[PDB]
Design a protein around this ligand. Structure first.
Ligand SMILES: [Cl-]
Ligand SMILES: [Cl-]
Ligand SMILES: [Cl-]
Ligand SMILES: [Mg+2]
Ligand SMILES: [Mg+2]
Ligand SMILES: [Mg+2]
Ligand SMILES: [Mg+2]
Ligand SMILES: [Mg+2]
Ligand SMILES: [Mg+2]
Ligand SMILES: [Mg+2]
Ligand SMILES: [Mg+2]
Ligand SMILES: [Mg+2]
Ligand SMILES: [Mg+2]
Ligand SMILES: [Mg+2]
Ligand SMILES: [Mg+2]
Ligand SMILES: [Mg+2]
Ligand SMILES: [Mg+2]
Ligand SMILES: [Mg+2]
Ligand SMILES: [Mg+2]
Ligand SMILES: [Mg+2]
Ligand SMILES: [Mg+2]
Ligand SMILES: [Mg+2]
Ligand SMILES: [Mg+2]
Lengths: 156, 127, 197, 106, 49
RNA sequence: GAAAUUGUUGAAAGGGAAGGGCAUUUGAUCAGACA
RNA sequence: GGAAUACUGCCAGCUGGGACUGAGGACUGCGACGUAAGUCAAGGAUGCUGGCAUAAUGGUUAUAUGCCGCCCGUCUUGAAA
RNA sequence: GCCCUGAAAAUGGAUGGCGCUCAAGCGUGUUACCUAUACUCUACCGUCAGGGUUGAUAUGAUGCCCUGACGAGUAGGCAGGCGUGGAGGUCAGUGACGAAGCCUAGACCGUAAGGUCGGGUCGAACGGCCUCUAGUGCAGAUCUUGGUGGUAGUAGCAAAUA
RNA sequence: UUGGCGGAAAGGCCUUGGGUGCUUGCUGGCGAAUUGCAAUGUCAUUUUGCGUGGGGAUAAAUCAUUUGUAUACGACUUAGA
């Protein structure tokens, strides 16, 4: 024999885990995040864009709209830790967002229903934006840091 | 394809080389404890090589485990291989260095039938 | 914040300026020092002249070309003080010293650029009035610097050209200010004032 | 516009060290515009990326990144301590780093 | 220190000076100052400037 | 048919020695799981 | 004559940001919240999601950079000598 | 009190260096900050101590498991292990379809002594485990024998007429 | 493209004229999605090499020989179509 067989062989069965005392409780957002607030994206394909926050989803994500007709940002999800909440707020009453949920953004060219629902949501938002001067132009521009800007001193 | 285990941690991956084994050819790298009265290695002065000690011992739950999670067992023939028939999730067979080319074919065929992992299946392969 | 910072050495204490510049170089900032002949050193002229003589008598006994090298130019005197505050024998120290340039006067590459000052090293803000101080240009001449008159003549020519530029710029600034003054009291001007601008 | 920057410029100063011993696991970072520990509290937890170039391309790019995070403040002059997944190389003493605005508490 | 700004040479040079510019005078084609002499071929604008 | 020592070829570094410890960059090279 | 505030101390008062750690592996204990069923932050981490599945992580090796590192053995109160 | 005179040594020179003058000096007071193999908490290794568990049908009661504390070391003591030549037993062990040896900035295991595998070279014997035995482990002793360097294509190869 | 100025390392600065693109000074109309909830998400300047074509220019040094104003050897200084 090349090697003597072990006298004792360990067990081959897998023990079950102990009961875990970790109950999931709903996330609470920071006070600055209110529906209708203008948000500044900090990362991703649309980094620097200014979008409108609409609804909080079940998966701790935020539903946002550009609107797509203004800056080209469609209805998407963003992480709450990757946005900056400004003080500018747009009225959100009159916008139907109950249809959008986690399964609506399921992964599984462009889907026909997504385009149609984009125009329905944007129609109400754009009407509200027109009542504030320079608001449409503000959402079209992109945010950036200039020389001498101190983020710890800037007020949004 | 082995039993679940905690992450394997190595406290000291670097080899312990004998002092001044890189200075003279007559001094091998096999570890030897310096016992000189004035030796800076024995006295543990800052900036010198580290010495092996029991504090580096690995966790007993992952000791002797290969990165795949199996323990190595040396096998010379089919009968030795069949010892691991009911221990396929903890032991892997390794063919001895002095096994002929024709006898390795029989062992590899038997090991695949029993589901026993082989760590060196390409040895003496006439491909 | 500038990619290159140009420091006017006039009225600066050599030691306090050297410590500031050395830290800037090690942090990755390029520094250019001009008018090194106008640097100041605390203490009367005789004391600093005596100190340089003590430096002059130090040399390798068996070969004078091996010992310490005594540079007489004002720019190199400031360089010596600066190199003593940097670990110049390391690769990191060598890289830092390559970010520094010292000149007597203001050479043509920098005479049309902006020059700044270092308040921490300013003689007028640091020394108590009545204390004696020495000008680096005069000290260098007494120890064997040959180009004091040449730099003085070139500096006089540069100042004449700079004065003409300022007179032209000042006239243009007056016209621009008047345009802004008459553009005030408008609707746009009032809105800017409400927002701080 | 002419500018697209979404980060704060920073400099890699050195490792955490005593007079004669250094600790490469911790790096000291200087953030532009911060000159007080109270101001430096804003940047705690922010992600840090070091961006450098290489001649060889591997995953469709010749640019490589080393990621880190601000952990705590350092001294009285706005310097902060940072830790990276792999320690920053010593040749980067005096090089530029990027301090991002995420994760965001605003 | 003093620095030389420009040097202006005469139109014609004898073989005595041209030998100073060669190490193998007997093998050379004696092309020295041939293109410089063309500066005088004009009215003299290059030399006068 | 080992070492000291040597030739050729290949790779790399070198401003008054070389060699070493901790950490990472770069180059080269390589194992493990695709359940 | 009537208060306020500073200073010192206490609260089994409330609350925001950052870092490091996740050891254990059926149940058993002590409590909390509830009429009850039960639930819980109560004798040690779980849930959701994305990219990649290969030299990407990692190992080895050469080199570079920051800091540190004097030649071993021996006698000796004391050795780089 | 501070400063100055008193105050002279041999290579060039040292508050550690640069340099510093309402100091970056001297006396004193108040806070912030930096960092040891020390202190606090957690993980892992080992040691010691106090305990639990024989019940068959699944293998080690020298087993497995729970709890707490501890860890510097020359001369020196003790303990547990690694490696070598030979011997009894066993694996009806490996091998000319390639044993042993040697080379290999290739891979794996062990805190370590070491063990294992792949590739190249090679040609006839050799190994694991339980025990027995010793002419059993080298860096030094102006150590023994043999081999080989730098010095170095260097010193030199110039008396006696050609 | 007109002219002037700048030699401390000038290699830059200012100015004339017209051509052309853009203009967010103001008002409009279309486009963006799918990089799927972040991943530098690649936009800079260093050097050199190999193929294109539009111009420009057609040499020297060394060895060997020779000289002695030189010389241990190298070096130096002279000559030779
Ligand atoms: Cl180094
Ligand atoms: Cl071992
Ligand atoms: Cl000669
Ligand atoms: Mg001793
Ligand atoms: Mg002189
Ligand atoms: Mg032979
Ligand atoms: Mg050899
Ligand atoms: Mg790696
Ligand atoms: Mg040292
Ligand atoms: Mg004695
Ligand atoms: Mg000794
Ligand atoms: Mg004091
Ligand atoms: Mg001990
Ligand atoms: Mg063999
Ligand atoms: Mg080798
Ligand atoms: Mg034979
Ligand atoms: Mg013996
Ligand atoms: Mg020996
Ligand atoms: Mg010995
Ligand atoms: Mg000997
Ligand atoms: Mg000879
Ligand atoms: Mg002789
Ligand atoms: Mg003779």
């Amino acid at each position: 024999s090349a090697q003597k067989a072990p006298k004792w062989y360990p067990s081959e069965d897998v023990a079950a885990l102990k009961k875990t005392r970790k109950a999931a409780r709903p996330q609470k957002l920071r006070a600055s995040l209110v529906p209708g607030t203008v948000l500044i994206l900090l990362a991703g394909r649309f980094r620097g864009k200014r979008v409108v926050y609409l609804k909080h989803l079940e998966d701790n994500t935020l539903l946002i709209s550009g609107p797509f007709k203004v800056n080209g940002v469609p209805l998407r999800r963003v992480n709450a830790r990757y946005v900056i909440a400004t003080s500018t707020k747009v009225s959100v009453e009159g916008v139907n967002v109950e249809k959008f949920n986690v399964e609506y953004f399921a992964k599984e060219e462009i889907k026909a229903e997504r385009v149609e629902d984009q125009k329905v949501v944007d129609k109400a938002l754009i009407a509200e934006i027109k009542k504030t001067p320079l608001l449409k132009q503000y959402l079209s521009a992109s945010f950036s840091l200039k020389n001498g800007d101190k983020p710890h001193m800037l007020k949004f | 394809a082995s039993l679940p285990h905690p992450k394997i941690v190595k406290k000291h991956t670097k080899k312990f080389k004998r002092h001044h084994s890189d200075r003279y050819h007559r001094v091998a790298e096999n570890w030897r404890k310096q016992k000189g009265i004035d030796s800076v290695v024995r006295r543990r002065f800052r900036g010198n090589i580290s010495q092996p000690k029991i504090g580096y011992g690995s966790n007993k739950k992952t000791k002797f485990l290969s990165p795949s999670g199996h323990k190595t067992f040396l096998v010379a023939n089919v009968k030795d291989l069949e010892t691991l028939t009911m221990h396929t999730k903890t032991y892997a067979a390794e063919i001895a260095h002095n096994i002929s080319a024709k006898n390795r074919v029989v062992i590899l065929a038997r090991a695949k039938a029993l589901g026993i992992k082989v760590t060196n299946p390409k040895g003496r392969l006439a491909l | 914040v500038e990619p290159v910072v140009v420091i006017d050495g006039k009225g600066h204490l050599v030691g306090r300026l050297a410590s500031v510049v050395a830290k800037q170089l090690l942090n990755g900032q390029k520094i250019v020092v001009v008018r090194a002949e106008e640097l100041n050193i605390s203490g009367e002229f005789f004391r600093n002249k005596l100190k340089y003589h003590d430096f002059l008598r130090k040399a390798t006994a068996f070969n004078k070309t091996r010992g310490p090298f005594h540079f007489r130019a004002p720019s190199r005197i400031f360089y010596k003080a600066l190199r003593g505050m940097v670990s110049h024998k390391t690769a990191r120290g060598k890289a830092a010293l390559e970010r520094l340039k010292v000149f007597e006067g203001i050479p043509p590459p920098y005479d049309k650029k902006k020059r700044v000052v270092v308040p921490q090293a300013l003689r007028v803000l640091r020394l108590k009035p009545g204390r004696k101080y020495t000008t680096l240009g005069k000290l260098s001449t007494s120890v064997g610097w040959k180009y004091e008159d040449v730099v003085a003549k070139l500096e006089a020519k540069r100042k004449v050209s700079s004065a003409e530029y300022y007179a032209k710029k000042r006239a243009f600034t007056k016209k621009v200010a008047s345009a802004n003054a008459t553009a005030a009291e408008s609707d746009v001007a009032k809105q800017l004032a409400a927002l701080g601008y | 516009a002419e500018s697209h920057r979404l980060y704060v410029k920073g400099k890699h100063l050195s490792y955490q060290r005593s007079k004669r011993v250094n600790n490469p696991n911790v790096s000291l970072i200087k953030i532009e515009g911060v000159a007080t520990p109270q101001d430096a509290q804003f940047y705690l937890g922010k992600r840090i990326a070091y961006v450098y170039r290489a001649s060889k391309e591997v995953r469709g790019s010749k640019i490589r990144v080393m990621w880190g995070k601000v952990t705590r403040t350092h001294g009285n002059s706005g310097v902060v301590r940072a830790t990276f997944r792999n320690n920053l190389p010593a040749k980067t003493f005096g090089a530029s780093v990027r301090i991002f605005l995420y994760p965001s508490n605003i | 220190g003093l620095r030389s700004l420009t040097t202006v040479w005469a139109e014609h040079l004898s073989d005595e000076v041209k030998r100073r510019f060669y190490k193998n005078w007997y093998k050379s084609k004696k092309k020295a100052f041939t293109k410089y002499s063309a500066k005088y071929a004009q009215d003299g604008a290059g030399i006068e400037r």
